[PDB]
Amino acid sequence: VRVDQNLFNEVMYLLDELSQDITVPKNVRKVAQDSKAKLSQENESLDLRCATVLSMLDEMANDPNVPAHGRTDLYTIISKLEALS
């Protein structure tokens, strides 16, 4: 319980921060927006929500327009989702 909810809480906070971060590209903010909505789709299985979000964030982490600090922010979130999955 605790271990998964602390990871989930951190992922939501970090995605919210990323969505508001003017130092990463528009498309990264939008993916962060869509990710946090997907994780909030309380009618769908968590493992499933996480898989879709992991796919979305991985795509962004591989976009060469993303600045180094934004890539690390993406990897931090990915790393918590893979621990939660």
From Swiss-Prot:
Q: SUPFAM superfamilies annotated for this entry?
A: Ta0600-like
- Tell me its family: Belongs to the UPF0147 family.
Quote the NCBIfam families the UniProt record gives.
Answer: PRK04330.1
Q: What is this protein called?
A: UPF0147 protein Ta0600
Biological classification of the source: Archaea, Methanobacteriati, Thermoplasmatota, Thermoplasmata, Thermoplasmatales
